[PDB]
C-alpha cells in the first residue's frame, strides 16, 4: 500500500496540556518547486474501553509556497464540527507537525464510553508531487485516556506585566525578557517556572537538571521541560548576568519552549515565575501573540553542488542515501528542473530498481551500475547554467535531496 513507511514513537511528558502534538520530519518538500501539490490523508486509531476504532481525515492539496496551517477538508466518525478539532502546520526544513485538541471528544461514542477514549497510534498518508504515496506511523508506546472538560481561563492578575509580547512562530516560542532583582549578584537558589493559558489550554514548564545554585557571571544556560509532547528539538533557557533605583540589580533571561500550538488562541497569556532566596515566587507575565508567518524554509535541506563539463553530455555520480540499507529492498529516485512550470509534464522523471525509464520527462536518463552509484546522464542543456533537483530514498533510509547546478563551461 504505502511506498515508503516511517515508524516513530510518541513521547508524552507530564500532564496533557490540552492537545496532542506530533512532528513528522521525514516527508519530502522539494526546493524551487512552487507547484508542489502534495495530498494527504490522516488516520488515527482510538482504543475506547478496549474497542479498536478509527478516525480518517482528509487534508487535500498542499501549497507550501503560499499556505502554512490547514484545517481538515472532512472527517469520518467525528463529533460536532469535528474538523475544527485538528490542525496540520508546516515548520520548515521539510518538517511539519500535527495538532489535535484533547479536551473535547473527536469521535462519537455512546454514553459511558466518553471517559474511556484513548489514543493508540496515528498514521499520516502523503501523496507526493510525483504521485508516490509516502506514509508515517506514530505509536503511543503508552496511551493516554482523554478527559473532556471545559477548563476555565485563569489570570494571575497580581503579576507584573512587561510589554515584550511573546511571538509564537513555527510552533517554537523564543522571547528574551529583562529582570530587576534585589542584588543576588551570586547564587540565591534561583528557580523558575512558566505557565501559558488560554482557550482551555494550560502549558506548564519546569527546570531540568535541578535548580540554579551554580551561577556564573555572563551567560548561564539551563535545560527546561514543558508539560506536553516534547519536540525532537529540545526546549531551553539561558540567563544573562547584568548590564555594564532601590538597589535594583539588572538581569536578563532568554527562553525557547516549542511544544506550543495555536490552540491557545490569539488572546492567550504567558506567565513566568522566578525566585531568589524565597516553584517560583517572583512573577512576570506577557501577552501571547501568534505569527501568521509562512515558514520560509519548507524547501528540504539541499546538498548544494555545482557541476560542469563539455557540450550537453553532462553526468553526475549520484551517491547513496545517508544510512542506506545496502541491499536496498526497494528504491526510488526522481528529479526535475528548477522552478518547474507544468505539474503533469515536468514531474515524470522517476526510476526504481525494476522500472527502467518510463514515458515523459526527456533530457534526462540514467541507471544503476555495479558501482552501485547511480550514474545519471542528461542532454539538451542550454547555452547558460541550469539547476537540477534530485531526490533518492530506499527502504528504512532517510530521504536525501541534491541541488545540482549544471554550470556551463567557462570561456
Amino acid at each position, epitope marked *: 500500500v504505502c511506498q515508503y513507511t516511517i515508524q516513530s514513537l510518541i513521547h*508524552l511528558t507530564g500532564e496533557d496540556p490540552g492537545f496532542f502534538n506530533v512532528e513528522i520530519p521525514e516527508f519530502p518538500f522539494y526546493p524551487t518547486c512552487n507547484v508542489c501539490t502534495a495530498d494527504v490523508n490522516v488516520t488515527i486509531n482510538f482504543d475506547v474501553g478496549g474497542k479498536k476504532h478509527q478516525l480518517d481525515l482528509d487534508f487535500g492539496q498542499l501549497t507550501p509556497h503560499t499556505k502554512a496551517v490547514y484545517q481538515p477538508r472532512g472527517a469520518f466518525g467525528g463529533s460536532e464540527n469535528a474538523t475544527n478539532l485538528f490542525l496540520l502546520e508546516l515548520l520548515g526544513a521539510g518538517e511539519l507537525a500535527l495538532t489535535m485538541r484533547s479536551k473535547k471528544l473527536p469521535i462519537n461514542v455512546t454514553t459511558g464510553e466518553e471517559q474511556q477514549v484513548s489514543l493508540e497510534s496515528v498514521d499520516v498518508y502523503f501523496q507526493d508531487v510525483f504521485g508516490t504515496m509516502w506514509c508515517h506511523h506514530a505509536e503511543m508506546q503508552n496511551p493516554v485516556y482523554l478527559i473532556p472538560e471545559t477548563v476555565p481561563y485563569i489570570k494571575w492578575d497580581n503579576c507584573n506585566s512587561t510589554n515584550i509580547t511573546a511571538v509564537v512562530r513555527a510552533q517554537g516560542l523564543d522571547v528574551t525578557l529583562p529582570l530587576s532583582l534585589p542584588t543576588s549578584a551570586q547564587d540565591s537558589n534561583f528557580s523558575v517556572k512558566t505557565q501559558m493559558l488560554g482557550n482551555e489550554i494550560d502549558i506548564e514548564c519546569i527546570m531540568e537538571d535541578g535548580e540554579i545554585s551554580q551561577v556564573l557571571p555572563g551567560d548561564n544556560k539551563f535545560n527546561i521541560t514543558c508539560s506536553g509532547y516534547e519536540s525532537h528539538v529540545p526546549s531551553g533557557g539561558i540567563l544573562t548576568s547584568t548590564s555594564p533605583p532601590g538597589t535594583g540589580y539588572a538581569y536578563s533571561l532568554r527562553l525557547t519552549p516549542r511544544p506550543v500550538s495555536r490552540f491557545l488562541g490569539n488572546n492567550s497569556i504567558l506567565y513566568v515565575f522566578y525566585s531568589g532566596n524565597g516553584g517560583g515566587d517572583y512573577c512576570i507575565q506577557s501577552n501571547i501573540v501568534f505569527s501568521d508567518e509562512i515558514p520560509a524554509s519548507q524547501d528540504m535541506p539541499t546538498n548544494t553542488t555545482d557541476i560542469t563539463y563539455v557540450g550537453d553530455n553532462a553526468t553526475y555520480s549520484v551517491p547513496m542515501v545517508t544510512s542506506e540499507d545496502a541491499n536496498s529492498p526497494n528504491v526510488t529516485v526522481t528529479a526535475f528542473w528548477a522552478w518547474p512550470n507544468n505539474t503533469e509534464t515536468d514531474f515524470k522523471c522517476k526510476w526504481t530498481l525494476t522500472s527502467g525509464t518510463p514515458s515523459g520527462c526527456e533530457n534526462i536518463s540514467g541507471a544503476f551500475a555495479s558501482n552501485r552509484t547511480f550514474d545519471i546522464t542528461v542532454s539538451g542543456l542550454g547555452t547558460a547554467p541550469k539547476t537540477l533537483i534530485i531526490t533518492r530514498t530506499a527502504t528504512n533510509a532517510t530521504t536525501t535531496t541534491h541541488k545540482v547546478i549544471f554550470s556551463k563551461a567557462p570561456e
Partner: antibody, heavy 120, light 107 residues
Framework: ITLKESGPTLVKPTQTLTLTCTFS??????????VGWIRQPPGKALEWLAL??????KRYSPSLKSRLTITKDTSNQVVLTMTNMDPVDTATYYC??????????????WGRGTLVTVSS | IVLTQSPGTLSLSPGERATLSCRAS???????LAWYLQKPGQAPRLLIY???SRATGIPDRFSGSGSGTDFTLTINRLEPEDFAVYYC????????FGQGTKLEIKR
C-alpha cells in the same frame, strides 16, 4: 491514605481465587485514581496482575488476561478474581494505588499484602 | 517487556555507595521508569520516577540514572537502615519488574 487486603489465604487446585482490596483516603468514583494488584511468589520477582481505573476500564497482564477479572463493589472496595488455579500461583498478593490516569504508569501506594497458599 | 538487574545480595560497608544497574531489552521511553524497595516482613516502598525524580520524604541521598536499555541506581552514604531488597519497574509499556537485588551490611 491506606489500603487493606482481604480474602481466603488458601485455595484448592483448579478452584477459583477471590481477593478484596479495601481502602480509605481516596474516592474512585471521582477521577484520576487507579487500583491494581501485584503478586510475588516468595523469592521470585514481582509480577503485575491487574489494574482498574476511575473510568472503569480494566487492563490485565497479557499472559493472564485469560484467567482474571477485577471489579468494583462499594465506594471503598475493589475485588480481584482468578480462576483455574495451580499451586505455582502460591504467592503473596498485593493491591496498590495510582494517582495518575496515564494508562501504563507507576504505583504510588501499596497495601501490606496477604499470602495465598494453593495446595490440596 | 523485560528487565534485568545487577548481581544479587550485594554486601557493602556503611558509608560506601550503592551501584545497581537495571538493563532492559527494549528501550522504554526513558522518561518512564521507577525504583522500589522492599524489606521482608514489610511491604514495598516507592523511591524514584524516571530514574531521577525523588518521591516524598526521600532525601538527596539517592540518585538513579540511565535511559533506554540501561537504567542505573545509586545510594550515597550507606546506612544500616537502607539494607533491604530493591527492584526497578518499567512503565511506558506493559508493566514489568526486574528480578530483584538485595543488600547486606558488611559488619
Amino acid at each position: 491514605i491506606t489500603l487493606k487486603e482481604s480474602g481466603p489465604t488458601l485455595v484448592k487446585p483448579t478452584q477459583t481465587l477471590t481477593l478484596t482490596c479495601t481502602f480509605s483516603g481516596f474516592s474512585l468514583n471521582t477521577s484520576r485514581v487507579g487500583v491494581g494488584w501485584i503478586r510475588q511468589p516468595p523469592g521470585k520477582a514481582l509480577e503485575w496482575l491487574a489494574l482498574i481505573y476511575w473510568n472503569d476500564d480494566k487492563r490485565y497482564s497479557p499472559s493472564l488476561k485469560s484467567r482474571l477479572t477485577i471489579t468494583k463493589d462499594t465506594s471503598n472496595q475493589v475485588v480481584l478474581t482468578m480462576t483455574n488455579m495451580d499451586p505455582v500461583d502460591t504467592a503473596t498478593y498485593y493491591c496498590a494505588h495510582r494517582y495518575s490516569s496515564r494508562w501504563y504508569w507507576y504505583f504510588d501506594l501499596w497495601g501490606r499484602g496477604t499470602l495465598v497458599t494453593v495446595s490440596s | 517487556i523485560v528487565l534485568t538487574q545487577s548481581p544479587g545480595t550485594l554486601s557493602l560497608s556503611p558509608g560506601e555507595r550503592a551501584t545497581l544497574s537495571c538493563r532492559a531489552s527494549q528501550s522504554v521511553s526513558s522518561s518512564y521508569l521507577a525504583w522500589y524497595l522492599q524489606k521482608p516482613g514489610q511491604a514495598p516502598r516507592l523511591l524514584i520516577y524516571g530514574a531521577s525524580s525523588r518521591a516524598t520524604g526521600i532525601p538527596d541521598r539517592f540518585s538513579g540514572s540511565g535511559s533506554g536499555t540501561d537504567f542505573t541506581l545509586t545510594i550515597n552514604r550507606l546506612e544500616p537502615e537502607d539494607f533491604a531488597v530493591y527492584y526497578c519497574q518499567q512503565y511506558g509499556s506493559s508493566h514489568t519488574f526486574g528480578q530483584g537485588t538485595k543488600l547486606e551490611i558488611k559488619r
